[PDB]
Amino acid sequence: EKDYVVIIGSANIDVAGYSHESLNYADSNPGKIKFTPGGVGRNIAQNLALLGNKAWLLSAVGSDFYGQSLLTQTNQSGVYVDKCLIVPGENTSSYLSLLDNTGEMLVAINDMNISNAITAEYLAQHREFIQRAKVIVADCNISEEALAWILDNAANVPVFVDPVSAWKCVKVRDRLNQIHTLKPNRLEAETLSGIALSGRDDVAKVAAWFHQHGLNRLVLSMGGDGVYYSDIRGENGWSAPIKTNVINVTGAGDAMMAGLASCWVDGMPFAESVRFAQGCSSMALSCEYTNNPDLSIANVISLVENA
Amino acid sequence: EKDYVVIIGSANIDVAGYSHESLNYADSNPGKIKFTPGGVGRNIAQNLALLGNKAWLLSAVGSDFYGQSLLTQTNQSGVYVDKCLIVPGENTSSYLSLLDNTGEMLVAINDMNISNAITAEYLAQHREFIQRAKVIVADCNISEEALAWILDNAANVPVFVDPVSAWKCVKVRDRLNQIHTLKPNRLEAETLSGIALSGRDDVAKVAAWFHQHGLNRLVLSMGGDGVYYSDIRGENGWSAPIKTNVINVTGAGDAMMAGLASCWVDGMPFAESVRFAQGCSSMALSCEYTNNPDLSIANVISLVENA
Ligand SMILES: [K+]
Ligand SMILES: [K+]
Secondary structure (H helix, E strand, O other), X not given: OOOEEEEEOOOEEEEEEEEOOOOOOXXXXXXXXXXXXXXXXXXXXXXXXXOOOEEEEEOEEEOOXXXXXXXXXXXXXXXXXXXXXXXXXXXXXXXXXXXXXXXXXXXXXEEOHHHHHOOHHHHHOOHHHHHOOOEEEEEXXXXXXXXXXXXXXXXXXXXXXXXXXXXXXXXXXXXXXXXXXXXXXXXXXXXXXXXXXXXXXXXXHHHXXXXXXXXXXXXXXXXXXXXXXXXXOOOEEEEOOOOOOOOOOOOHHHHHHHHHHHXXXXXXXXXXXXXXXXXXXXXXXXXOOOOOOOOOHHHHXXXXXXX | OOOEEEEEOOOEEEXXXXXXXXXOXXXXXXXXXXXXXXXXXXXXXXXXXXXXXXXXXXOEEEOOHHHHHHHXXXXXXXXXXXXXXXXXXXXXXXXXXXXXXXXXOOEEEEEOHHHHHOOHHHHHOOHHHHHOOOEEEEEOOOOHHHHHHHHHOOOOOOEEEEOOOOOOHHHHHHHHHHOOEEOOEHHHHHHHHOXXXXXXXXXXXXXXXXXXXXXXXXXXXXXXXXXEEEEOOOOEEEEOOOOOOOOOOXXXXXXXXXXXXXXXXXXXXXXXXXXXXXXXXXXXXXXXXXXXXXXXXXXXXXXXXXX
C-alpha cells in the first residue's frame, strides 16, 4: 500500500481499418474496423498496472463520450485515471490507420492536439502527488513547457523519458541532465546526438555523447541488433533481442519502458532490468493488441529465462 | 403521452479523418479525426427524439466500451436505448472515412457486420412492445430474415422502410405489399423496379410499377429535381427541393425518414408530410454533423414556410 508510479503522457483511441476484398477507391469498401486504446503514456500506464504497480495516469481527453470510455477501459486495466484532465469543447485524440488484408499500413492520420492540454498548470495542480511517486514516466508527446515543468519539479524523483519519435524527441536534447533514463531507438539517438549509427562501433560514440551532455542512463533500442545500455558511472553492455514471433510491432516500446520503470521500483540492477524490459517488449510483439493482456511479472520472467 | 415509435436499424460509430496538409503515404500524417454517432436506424431514432417523439431504438452494439458510449451519447439525445442488444465478444460496427483538405471523400471502410446480430429471436423477445408502437421504422442494414420478421409481425402497425443503398434495398422487392412507406433515391428505385429513371416521364412508370407490386406509399428522392410522392390510392405529386446551404450531405435521408414517420404520427396529410420531411433533410444538409442538433418542429416549420 502507497508506493505508486505517475505516468504523464498522451491517451488516444487507435482506429485500425482494413478492407477485406481489395480497395475500390472513392467507395465504401466492406472490411474490419477495430477500436483499441492507444497513446504512449496511457499504454505504458496500462503495462505498469499489468506488471502489478499502482499506476496513476496524468493525461488529457475530450468532453466527448468516447474519451470517457477510453478512461473507463484504461481504469479496468488497473490504472487510476481519476486525475486525468477532461477537456470541454474539445475532442479525444486519435490515431487513424488504414491497412490491408496482409496488415501493412497503407496510410495513417493522427489528431493529437489535446496533448497540449496537458499543461504545466495542470500538473502543478498535482505537484505534491507527483513529487511523492516512486518514479515518474513521461512521453515526449507533451509540450516542451510541460516536460520542462516535470523535469524542473521532480524533487529528486527519477524521471524515465520516452522520446516517442524522431520529431518529438528533440525537446529532450537540452535537458538530458535532468533525465534518469532515456529510451531512444536508432533514429531518435542519431537525431539527438547528431552522430550517425552506421555500425555498432558507433554506439559507444553515441553513448559517450549522451553521457557528456548529462544523461544518467541510456537504453538504446537497435531493433534486431538488440539493446545497448549505458550508465554514466561506466557500466555498459549489449543485450541480444528476445527471439519472438512478431505478429504486431505496436506497443513494443511501451512495454519496454514499463518494464524499465517497474524493475527500477523493484530494486533490480540495470542490466537485468533491461533484459526484463526486453521480455516485456517481446510479449507485446507476440500480441495483436498494443497491450498484451497476458503481460505479467511471472510470464515475462518465464519468457526471459527461456534463453 | 405513451405513444411511441420503434426504430429497428444499425448503430455505428463514424470516424472521419482528414490531413491538414498533403498526404504523405506510408507515414503518420497530422490531421483531424472526429467521432460522430452514425447508422441509419440510430440516426433516424435521434432525429425522431429531436422531433419530440418518444423513440425506442432496437439495434446491436458490441461488448466494447465504445459501443456503450455510443448508446449513452444516443440516450442523451432523448432516445431510449434500453432494449438495444449488446453483443458479447465482438466489436461495435463502424464507418471509417478518409477525407481531404476540401472535405472530399478519398476512401471509406465499413464494418457493419454486427447488424446481423439484430436477429428475429431478438425482435421476438420484444414482439408485443413492437406491436404496440404507433409506427415501426426499419432500415435495410438488417438481414432479410429480420426485415421479413418485422413485416410479418407488425400487427397492422405501419412500417416505414429506409432502403439505405442500391445493394441492400433489393431485400425489399418481394415484400412491397407489406410496407406502408418506402423512401428510395433514383438508383434504389431503378434497382428495385428494373426501370431506368432517365427523365421525369419515367417517374410515373416507376411509381406505377411500385404500386402494382403492392407498395402503399412511395417517397422518391430525386436530388436536385426534388421528391416525387405517390399514393396507391391515386394521389401523386412533385415537391421542389428546399434551397439549402449544402455543407455536409450526410444524414439527409435519415432526417427525411424521421420527418415522414413523425408527421404520420401527428395526423398530417401525405403531401405536407413530404414537404416537412424535406425541411428536415434541409436542416440535416445545413449541418456539419450527421444529426443537426437544432432539428425541431418549430425550426423545420419556419424553414418550410420560407417559399
Ligand atoms: K502488438
Ligand atoms: K450533414
